[PDB]
Amino acid sequence: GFSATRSTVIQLLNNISTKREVEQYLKYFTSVSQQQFAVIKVGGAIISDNLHELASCLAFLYHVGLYPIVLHGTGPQVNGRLEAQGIEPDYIDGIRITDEHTMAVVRKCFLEQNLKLVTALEQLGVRARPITSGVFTADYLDKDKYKLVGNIKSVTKEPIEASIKAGALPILTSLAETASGQMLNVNADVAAGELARVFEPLKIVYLNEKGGIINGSTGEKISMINLDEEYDDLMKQSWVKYGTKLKIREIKELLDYLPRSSSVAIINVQDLQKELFTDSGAGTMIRR
Amino acid sequence: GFSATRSTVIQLLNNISTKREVEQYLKYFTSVSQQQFAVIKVGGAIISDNLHELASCLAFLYHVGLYPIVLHGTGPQVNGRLEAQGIEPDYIDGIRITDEHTMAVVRKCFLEQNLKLVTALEQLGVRARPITSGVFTADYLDKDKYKLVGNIKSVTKEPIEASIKAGALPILTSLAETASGQMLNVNADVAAGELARVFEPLKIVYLNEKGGIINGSTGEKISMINLDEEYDDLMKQSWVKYGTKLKIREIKELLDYLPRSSSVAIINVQDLQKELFTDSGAGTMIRRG
Amino acid sequence: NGFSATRSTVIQLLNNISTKREVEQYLKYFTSVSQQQFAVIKVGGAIISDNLHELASCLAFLYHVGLYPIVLHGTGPQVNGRLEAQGIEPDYIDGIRITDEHTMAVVRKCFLEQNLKLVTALEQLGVRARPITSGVFTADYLDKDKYKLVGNIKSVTKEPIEASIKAGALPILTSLAETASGQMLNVNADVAAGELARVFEPLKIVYLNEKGGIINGSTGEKISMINLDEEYDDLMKQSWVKYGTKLKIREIKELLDYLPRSSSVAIINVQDLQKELFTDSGAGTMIRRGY
Amino acid sequence: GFSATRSTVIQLLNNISTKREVEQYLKYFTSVSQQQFAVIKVGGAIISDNLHELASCLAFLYHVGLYPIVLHGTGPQVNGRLEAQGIEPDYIDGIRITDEHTMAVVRKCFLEQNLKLVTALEQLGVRARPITSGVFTADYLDKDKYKLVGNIKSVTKEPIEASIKAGALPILTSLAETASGQMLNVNADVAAGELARVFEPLKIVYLNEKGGIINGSTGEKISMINLDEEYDDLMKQSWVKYGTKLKIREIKELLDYLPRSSSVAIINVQDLQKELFTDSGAGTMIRRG
Numbered sequence A: 001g002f003s004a005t006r007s008t009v010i011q012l013l014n015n016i017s018t019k020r021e022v023e024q025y026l027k028y029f030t031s032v033s034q035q036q037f038a039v040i041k042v043g044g045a046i047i048s049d050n051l052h053e054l055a056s057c058l059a060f061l062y063h064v065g066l067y068p069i070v071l072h073g074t075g076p077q078v079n080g081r082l083e084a085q086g087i088e089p090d091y092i093d094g095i096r097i098t099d100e101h102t103m104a105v106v107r108k109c110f111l112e113q114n115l116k117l118v119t120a121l122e123q124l125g126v127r128a129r130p131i132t133s134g135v136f137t138a139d140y141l142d143k144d145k146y147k148l149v150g151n152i153k154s155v156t157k158e159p160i161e162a163s164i165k166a167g168a169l170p171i172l173t174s175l176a177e178t179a180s181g182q183m184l185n186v187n188a189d190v191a192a193g194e195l196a197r198v199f200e201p202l203k204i205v206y207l208n209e210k211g212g213i214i215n216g217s218t219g220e221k222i223s224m225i226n227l228d229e230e231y232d233d234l235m236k237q238s239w240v241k242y243g244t245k246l247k248i249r250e251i252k253e254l255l256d257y258l259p260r261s262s263s264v265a266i267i268n269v270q271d272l273q274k275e276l277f278t279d280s281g282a283g284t285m286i287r288r
Numbered sequence B, D: 001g002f003s004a005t006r007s008t009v010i011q012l013l014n015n016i017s018t019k020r021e022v023e024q025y026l027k028y029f030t031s032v033s034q035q036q037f038a039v040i041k042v043g044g045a046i047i048s049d050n051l052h053e054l055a056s057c058l059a060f061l062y063h064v065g066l067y068p069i070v071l072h073g074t075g076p077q078v079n080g081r082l083e084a085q086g087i088e089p090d091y092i093d094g095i096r097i098t099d100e101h102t103m104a105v106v107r108k109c110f111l112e113q114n115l116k117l118v119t120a121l122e123q124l125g126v127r128a129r130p131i132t133s134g135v136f137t138a139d140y141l142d143k144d145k146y147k148l149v150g151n152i153k154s155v156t157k158e159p160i161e162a163s164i165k166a167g168a169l170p171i172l173t174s175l176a177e178t179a180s181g182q183m184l185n186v187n188a189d190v191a192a193g194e195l196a197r198v199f200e201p202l203k204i205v206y207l208n209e210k211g212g213i214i215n216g217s218t219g220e221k222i223s224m225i226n227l228d229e230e231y232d233d234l235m236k237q238s239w240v241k242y243g244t245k246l247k248i249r250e251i252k253e254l255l256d257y258l259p260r261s262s263s264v265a266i267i268n269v270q271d272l273q274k275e276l277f278t279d280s281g282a283g284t285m286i287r288r289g
Numbered sequence C: 001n002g003f004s005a006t007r008s009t010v011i012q013l014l015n016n017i018s019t020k021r022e023v024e025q026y027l028k029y030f031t032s033v034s035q036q037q038f039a040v041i042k043v044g045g046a047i048i049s050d051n052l053h054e055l056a057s058c059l060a061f062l063y064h065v066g067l068y069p070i071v072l073h074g075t076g077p078q079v080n081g082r083l084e085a086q087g088i089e090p091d092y093i094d095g096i097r098i099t100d101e102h103t104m105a106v107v108r109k110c111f112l113e114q115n116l117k118l119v120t121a122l123e124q125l126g127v128r129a130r131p132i133t134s135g136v137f138t139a140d141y142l143d144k145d146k147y148k149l150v151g152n153i154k155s156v157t158k159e160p161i162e163a164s165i166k167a168g169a170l171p172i173l174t175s176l177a178e179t180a181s182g183q184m185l186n187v188n189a190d191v192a193a194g195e196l197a198r199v200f201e202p203l204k205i206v207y208l209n210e211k212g213g214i215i216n217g218s219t220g221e222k223i224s225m226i227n228l229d230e231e232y233d234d235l236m237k238q239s240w241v242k243y244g245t246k247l248k249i250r251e252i253k254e255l256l257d258y259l260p261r262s263s264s265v266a267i268i269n270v271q272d273l274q275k276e277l278f279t280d281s282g283a284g285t286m287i288r289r290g291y
């Protein structure tokens, strides 16, 4: 699967002092099966604001023979559509309350974002498959409270494995279905975790536009978190917000389930290579 | 860029031998588009029974730069699965009564058949894209009677057009969605006719194992159906089973909308290349007339 | 060879096909397992300056369907323009350029320019081409006192041409020859192409010019067919058979004396090359022994 | 379209260790101008003695998108051929006296060596263009003394530049032509020096089997020659062989024209990549100082 374009060669010659790190991390990521390298979660905003960088970083991985499983959201675009129509979005515990009309908007938005990412990759000569259904099976998280929102109960691996075996990056929406075919909205961070539990990749990467987790009291970027030692302390800290406290609790539960060779990385999309192919990385890594 | 092997070019030359045929091929080969070449409906049984030949035929089309829109069924596999787990299939008027468990089976079988065909194509060097949702929008056909069965109200073309633009054959299931996201079961003959309605392709082909429609009173294959003359009579004949009635009604409604130059060919896969490259039909040809 | 039909190859192949007969003749070439060289094509030098894209396109078609021609080109007209611009009058006898030291310098520069133009035009269409500018033709002086630096070709070294083809590149040859000790000698491209056809015994022998064959000067009509055994002796006595036309006809007659009766030579415009190679054509001038 | 395999990229990464080296490689890898990366002179003996390693090294360069100008000799093969027909090689001052028959032997050997190297390269997937005339224009050096030997007066750059633009390594012999087309023999060290003068490449590399120049008084390889200081003294030393003297003089005269940042490396093929990718000299390095 390794086939370096001119662009790939140029990117590989970044931070040449780390070239032995680069070759070691390439070798490592390549040693496991093609479906156990990485789950990469993409925030919806990246597809609207930073599509070239997102497509380029995924093309880099593709061209060096790596097949990340790509799972994206679409939240900001949904809020845009709702707003144009005069409708305010509504969340509880960071989860969108999704009635029938809202689900219609969520579906349309997911499909548009999905095809945009797929097409941007194909324009770079990267084979990509839109996987928009048939992967996540769910029941209702809480119908009275969230309406059409899912709690994922099983994952069907076949579409992702087939894509990778055919030489195409699988590009998934985080939309789930009940077994009987009612589509149910699921938060992208949550859907990514479920993929990770089933595929057990070496890496789960959460891409954003803000960077890694920053310490409020000291202002410094948090490079690493050994969760066995630090979790109890970090959650006590009064600087961490509710939105950050929610993400970190579901990361803790994921890494408790996964083996210790798995790890999480929260990074700016433009720091993907630096995070993955150097010792010190770029954003926040989280180990158990 | 596009390239064709010696073997590909030899097979192409074996399929075209008149000025009209060459002109037709080149028109769609070099087409910057809007105009679609073909909608091909694939009977579900063909995926279980004759996959290599189906895949090989479609791969040849791809290797000569043609991009048919492919929609397949899965009815026979659903019946087998239901029967395997000790559940009796349930139909009314040739339409599957699809309760919640049945729909789960339908979805699983559709996905399995879809991936089987896509993967057979990839193995032959054909780029193929599964398209499993986001194309058909539907209302309930009759919720009390058929349960989770749809009546298609519109077709979203973008996924199909995006696949073709990227150089991948679009391989579609016939499942549709309500606007609020309830997936609904739709007979594949009906869904394929709705694709042909909105794309108005040069060729409209239905693949079955019988290679057409057989007249029950005579035991002879029907070569031609002139709908304007024969439709009302044909539909009153007691040998015409519900599945066939569903198909012919859809085709009749389709051909009422399309121009009189359009036709529908119900054929076996062995006659596909001849049906697509020439005007010398095979199997059962249906048109307005 | 490498058969790889691009979009343009497919279009070019099928555009003029309208019968099963035409389909069948293309199939004959594509399914053949013959090891005989497909073609020697002589290119009139003027075509490289006047119709380069079309020339390159036609040669590209052959390359893409795996039927590599051996290409030998001239450069006479642009040499004459160069000499004329320097206030020097071209000097010929019997179709052959009298070539003193200064003229040879001009000839060498023009050959190299035309050669690289053709090679580069092919490369720009994705066709690998190899300039072959020495090491093929070995010659003696034809007549030193009469013609000066002009060669009588004594042998053809095939290896350079065969290596090019084996590597997947069209061999693009100039018609200059060398004495054993390395004095380059000018040779008319019609003659040098004939020497290639003699030694390679190709299936097809085509001479490309702009007028599209040979014109009967008395009647003002393109000659469609020349049967040499019957017509040659009378042909050569005609008033309009002189200069370059006489040299051409004599060369082709001598070539065909050596080759089997099944061989023939077509003198055509490049626009008719595909039709004439593969299908039915009344274009240009066909020359054969006849019987 | 450019692609590189894993092993190619691994070998590239093994050759490049500093940021300076990265930027140097990128400058020539991404070039859209007429700048030249390298002129590499190949001793004739290497083509008979170590062809696979030479071809493999040049193929690596090609596979990382670098297009060195390659000029090779053939002296040892000519000597062998002359000796095979009972003729003693005849030199004066390191320059072959070349009568008509000797020229015929030189021409045939040059063509054979040239096609050997080109073909070795093509077998490794490298596009290579033989360039056997139309580059070097020369007068007679001294006709009474050396006979058919040339003094190069100009280099025509177009054939070499057209080759590189087409994605093919230009593989040159050192034969020259008088304006009126007499081929004249020219020592390959001199011809390669004339190429370096007009192309002003980043790297100037002479490949020989000894991997440099050995000091005869000590038996030790000379690592660095600083010409402004050492040239006059060096050329007086009685161990300095005919051929070596000619080479050192050409290089001295070449370096008088080039900027002081330039140098010439006389090395073995095993040190070629190190010499090209890094500024750590190997073998015998020559510069003005």
Ligand SMILES: CC(=O)N[C@@H](CCC(=O)O)C(=O)O
Residues within 6 Å of the ligand: A043, A044, A072, A073, A074, A075, A076, A078, A094, A095, A096, A106, A149, A174, A185, A186, A187, A188, A189
């Ligand atoms: C349940 C829920 O909040 N879903 C998300 C899915 C998109 C995303 O995560 O970006 C939403 O915003 O509707």
Ligand SMILES: CC(=O)N[C@@H](CCC(=O)O)C(=O)O
Residues within 6 Å of the ligand: B043, B044, B072, B073, B074, B075, B076, B078, B094, B095, B096, B106, B149, B174, B185, B186, B187, B188, B189
């Ligand atoms: C409603 C209905 O009958 N759907 C079909 C769809 C599959 C097919 O057509 O092959 C079914 O068998 O469930």
Ligand SMILES: CC(=O)N[C@@H](CCC(=O)O)C(=O)O
Residues within 6 Å of the ligand: C045, C073, C074, C075, C076, C077, C079, C095, C096, C097, C098, C107, C150, C175, C186, C187, C188, C189, C190
């Ligand atoms: C000897 C002779 O007439 N050579 C030809 C070669 C070029 C050509 O044929 O176009 C000439 O014009 O000099």
Ligand SMILES: CC(=O)N[C@@H](CCC(=O)O)C(=O)O
Residues within 6 Å of the ligand: D043, D044, D072, D073, D074, D075, D076, D078, D094, D095, D096, D097, D106, D149, D174, D185, D186, D187, D188, D189
């Ligand atoms: C003039 C002269 O000595 N030429 C060299 C050319 C070959 C080489 O340099 O290897 C010779 O040996 O004839």
Ligand SMILES: NC(=[NH2+])NCCC[C@H](N)C(=O)O
Residues within 6 Å of the ligand: A025, A223, A224, A263, A274, A275, A276, A277, A278, A279, A280, A281, A282, A283, A284, A285
């Ligand atoms: N933020 C960090 N400290 N990252 C360390 C990354 C280490 C290594 N590149 C990896 O991906 O596993």
Ligand SMILES: [Cl-]
Residues within 6 Å of the ligand: A075, A076, A079
């Ligand atoms: Cl938002």
Ligand SMILES: [Cl-]
Residues within 6 Å of the ligand: A133, A134, B107, B111, B132
């Ligand atoms: Cl599904």
Ligand SMILES: [Cl-]
Residues within 6 Å of the ligand: B043, B044, B045, B046, B207, B208, B209, B210
């Ligand atoms: Cl069937």
Ligand SMILES: [Cl-]
Residues within 6 Å of the ligand: C211, C212, C213, C222, C269, C283, C284
């Ligand atoms: Cl004509």
Ligand SMILES: [Cl-]
Residues within 6 Å of the ligand: D043, D044, D045, D046, D207, D208, D209, D210
């Ligand atoms: Cl040597």
